[PDB]
From a paper:
CPS secretion is mediated by an ABC transporter containing KpsT and KpsM as its nucleotide-binding domain (NBD) and transmembrane domain, respectively. The transporter partners with the periplasmic and inner-membrane-anchored KpsE subunit, a class-3 polysaccharide co-polymerase (PCP), as well as with KpsD, which is assumed to form an outer-membrane pore. The KpsMT transporter is surrounded by a cage of eight KpsE subunits extending about 80 Å into the periplasm. Cryo-electron microscopy analyses of the KpsMT–KpsE complex in six different states reveal a KpsE-encaged ABC transporter, rigid-body conformational rearrangements of KpsMT during ATP hydrolysis and recognition of a glycolipid inside a membrane-exposed electropositive canyon.
To determine how KpsMT recognizes the glycolipid, the purified KpsMT–KpsE complex was preincubated with the isolated glycolipid before cryo grid preparation. Cryo-EM analyses of this sample provided additional cryo-EM maps similar in overall architecture to the Apo 1 state, but with poorly defined KpsT subunits. KpsT was therefore placed after focused refinement and rigid-body docking. However, in contrast to all other structures, we identified two states of a lipid molecule bound inside the canyon (referred to as state-1 and state-2). In state-2, the lipid is shifted by about 7 Å towards the periplasm, such that the carboxyl group of the putative Kdo sugar is in proximity to Arg35 and Arg94 of the interface helix and TM2, respectively. The lipid phosphate group contacts Arg187 of TM5 in the opposing KpsM subunit. Furthermore, at the C-terminal end of this helix, Gln181 is suitably positioned to interact with the Kdo moiety. Relative to the estimated cytosolic and periplasmic membrane boundaries, the glycolipid sits about halfway across the membrane, in agreement with it representing a translocation substrate. Compared with state-1, the second lipid-binding pose further correlates with an approximately 6 Å rigid-body translation of the KpsM subunits against each other, thereby widening the space between the KpsM protomers and narrowing the entry to the polysaccharide canyon by around 3 Å. Extending this KpsM movement could create a channel-forming transporter conformation, as observed for the O-antigen WzmWzt transporter.
Residue numbers in the entry:
A (entry chain B), B (entry chain A): 1 to 226
C (entry chain J): 3 to 46
D (entry chain D), E (entry chain C): 14 to 269
F (entry chain K), G (entry chain J): 340 to 370
H (entry chain L): 340 to 371
I (entry chain I): 340 to 368
Write the structure that this text describes.
Amino acid sequence: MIELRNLTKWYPTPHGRRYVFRNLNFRFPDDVSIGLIGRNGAGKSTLMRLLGGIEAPNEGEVVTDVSISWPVGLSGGFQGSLTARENVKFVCRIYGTSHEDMLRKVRFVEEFAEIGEHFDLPMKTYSSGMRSRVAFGLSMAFDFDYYLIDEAMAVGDAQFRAKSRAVFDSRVGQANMILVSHNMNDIKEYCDVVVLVDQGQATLYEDVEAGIAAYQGSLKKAAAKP
Amino acid sequence: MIELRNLTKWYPTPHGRRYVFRNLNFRFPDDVSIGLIGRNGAGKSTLMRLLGGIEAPNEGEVVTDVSISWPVGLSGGFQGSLTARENVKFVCRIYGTSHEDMLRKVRFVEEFAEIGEHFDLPMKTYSSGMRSRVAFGLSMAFDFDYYLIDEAMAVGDAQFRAKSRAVFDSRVGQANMILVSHNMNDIKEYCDVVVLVDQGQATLYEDVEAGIAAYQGSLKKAAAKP
Amino acid sequence: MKLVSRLTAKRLQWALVYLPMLVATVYFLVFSADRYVSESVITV
Amino acid sequence: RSPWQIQQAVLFALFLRELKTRLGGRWLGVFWVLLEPVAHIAVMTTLFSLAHRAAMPSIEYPVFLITGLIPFFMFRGLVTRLMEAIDSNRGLFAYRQVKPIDTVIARAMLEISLQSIVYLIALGTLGWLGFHFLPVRALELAGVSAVLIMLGASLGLFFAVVTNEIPQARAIVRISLLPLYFVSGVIFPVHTIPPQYLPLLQLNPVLHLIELSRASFFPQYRVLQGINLAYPAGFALLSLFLALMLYRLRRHQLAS
Amino acid sequence: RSPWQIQQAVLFALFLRELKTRLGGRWLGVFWVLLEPVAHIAVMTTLFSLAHRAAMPSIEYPVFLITGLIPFFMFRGLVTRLMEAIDSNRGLFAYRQVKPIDTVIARAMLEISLQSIVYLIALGTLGWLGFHFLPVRALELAGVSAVLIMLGASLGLFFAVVTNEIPQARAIVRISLLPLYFVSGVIFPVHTIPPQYLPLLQLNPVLHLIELSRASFFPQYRVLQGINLAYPAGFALLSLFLALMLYRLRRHQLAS
Amino acid sequence: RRWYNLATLLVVCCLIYGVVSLVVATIRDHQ
Amino acid sequence: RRWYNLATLLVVCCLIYGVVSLVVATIRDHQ
Amino acid sequence: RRWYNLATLLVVCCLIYGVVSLVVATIRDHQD
Amino acid sequence: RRWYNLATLLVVCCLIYGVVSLVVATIRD
Ligand SMILES: CCCCCCCCCCCC(=O)O[C@@H](COC(=O)CCCCCCCCCC)COP(=O)(O)OC[C@H](O)CO[C@@]1(C(=O)O)C[C@H](O)[C@@H](O)[C@H]([C@@H](O)CO)O1
């Protein structure tokens, strides 16, 4: 179960406290695929950071009895100076796995990276898509109950997407994937329920198309406001 | 006229000197739109930085009798603690314009910024989009013979792209823009000549489609190598 | 290599704590000998 | 899992990380750490050996300087390294297990281990050269050193919590640390200090701890009037309480 | 446009840049550079007022301390900040007409301006408090100060060029500025120490420059043997030549 | 002087109990 | 001093045990 | 010198008030 | 003092081995 109790997150601004969320109490549905959608600036990034633990909420708490992964494709969870293998070492020792499984996961991230000698080179010299490949390898190497993805489709080349959806379908069914994507067809295909974030409030829809209609109506109301 | 005489640029690596370019002599064609294409890691970013003067070549020189602008969308040309207006002041103060042109350029940057009161705030609290918009405003607040773009198309929302291309179409004809993009259709539309970078060597193609065919053949040869 | 692999917590605890304490225990309480001290204070 | 086992996991992880960053990777920093005390001895002993022999003829100068310096170096490290603990590990502060208290605890453990190793090495070297290197009273010296540990770690945590913002203020920490090397009885005995400067000199807890450690080290060492353990012990206890309370207030505000 | 005009414009631009990044906008830097000296004369006085009045009962201690302190502050600031200029402004350059030497000499000229302002303020308040505040030979003082400024700027540029890609060595330079304050005749008259220590201390050019600056300030001031200006002049000339030649070698480098 | 040590030791146990409670709270923060 | 020496020996033994344990854990993880 | 003792009483009462306020805030944070 | 000289010679030789190995490791890269 995933729950947000009295959640309140804001950013410091010179004009005051810009509240992104305030007293947000909401329970995520169980064993279903979740599509988190919303307007730009409505707090989708803030909420996926709070779900993944990237940001600490000012008030309230997140109650979760299962394992939630970090967002896939984000490069802000690593350090530039060390080489890629050293970052895999770092994340493995934070999670604290056995040495044999440590070596196996290094082998797996080497396999899914397809990187070469730059695997022994520091991350500060990497490019955007290659850092995204490193992040994908670190995210996939593990086994997680819930996977957070902030629209990682539009990274890398076509072959990267091919292997991505291949191992995705390999992992389909053993975990529930939360997707924050502006591609609404992806929300149709890869999700079971729709949670929309608007004005700091999250609304749940068991039917995907109901959330589609609600989001489209909200966009039309925003556009029609004079 | 842009010419590269005996250019040799490399990066320090623990394994030795990784030569990116070595004795690169090449003359860019005049009064034409240039499309810089090449493989990943072939040196497009490094050569583009050398053209913009971002990095200093170890040997050789860059001979240019016209004005070449910095890459559009790059956020590494400013200072974090200064505000946006202070960064405008800094840039123009190297460039050294008159006070009327000072105030007009500040107003133009504020106009193309569409950021608001955060325009009076330091950029250390900015997001990537805000810094990219500031860079675009600075790259446009001036008048140059040649403009450098490191695939700045896929930054920002749709209205940002529409406004950027509107001012672009205002500025076509009076300058030659060099674009480094993986979108080959953009290379077709916005360029007249093609410069292909491979193995530290630049090959010139007066026909765009000839350079496209050469790049496709190079990619096929790289993929077919066992 | 394998030499540092056999240095488990129990083996290191034995080789560094319990044996020194044990040898000190068997020496000081029974094997030791009393040494009386007499003190004087002089000057010239 | 229990909080205790995940605590050992996370502290071991940050301990090996901190060993990596402080030692430079190739284990080059050990030479620096070993070379500062001996360089201090070489500078210190060449001007005041005769003065000390006139002052306290019964005590050898190098052992006096070891006992005066290495605890002070340990305290200075415990303050400085732990004050700047948050900024160094800032980029990896969002893993739900990497709270700042673990970072400061890991830095403290690393510094204690390193300086204890240096203490043992220096004592062995002193014994190897024919000096006097066995403390007559061992566990009282250990207790005084533990009081010094508690005071130093408490002050470091307090300064790290208080100065999370305004890092410029960190300057008036380390700049203020340099006079503490001179005013406390580290390099020259406070026996020669005129009594009219003595009262304010008693306000330094580090002076009390250094003097008590030296008294517990050497045989027949005299302590000055007004030196006691109660004042530095109370200072350490109060500072630890204040630092823990201040960290508990601003626990959630040290994440970015 | 002539290269001289380009140099003028670029040095003015990064002078404003440096002025901002040094005083921080809030102008707290002027507060610190006005309060650090008066702190030094405060503590230094309350230490050795009686000692100085017994050593040379002809010159008041505060004016001696000012004349020995402010040039040393200028020299230290020159060395440190002209060393750190390239590391600070690595984000700069890359836009043509900007070279490392521009940032180096901009930091230099800011340092001389600030320290000359502080010197004038100090002389003004010294005259305001009923102390001797007018040099008897101002031209010699100007020449000695120019020699010291040239030596400091040249050494700073030399260390900025040499210790590129090795930042840790910079720290060593910082710590070697600590003995100089205690050895270059700044806080106490140098005639007190025995002459057997004297010849080694003659290898320090800063002691020669400070003593010659003092000799050009007070009337009937005593200068001891071997304090000629030829040695500091040659030191400054050689250091400037080496620094300029090394910068010319690593000119196309140093730009990221 | 009985009341002096009574008050001093009361302050000491209050401080020690507070320190231990804060330490165990920080330990139990991890879940 | 029998119990005295036992106490000091136990303290130093615990200290060297802790330092050596940290060292062996470090070298085991490094390999 | 009544004003002098009042002046010291100002700062000692302010210190006591600050310390007890911090303790109360700690207890309140513990009661969340 | 044959054992004493042997032990201190071991110490200095090991120290010089360590410093030359550190120098070699720094200059190999
Ligand atoms: C709790 C306050 C107590 C104040 C004590 C003052 C005494 C003198 C201290 C020396 C003051 C000092 O700094 O040391 C000097 C040399 O010291 C000595 O030889 C001491 C000789 C005798 C003293 C010992 C005898 C003790 C006898 C009984 C007490 C060079 O050290 P250093 O190379 O590290 O200097 C670096 C700067 O300090 C950097 O600081 C900055 C700045 O200037 O750029 C940085 C930044 O700008 C900002 O953070 C910061 C500012 O803005 C924020 O206030 O100033």
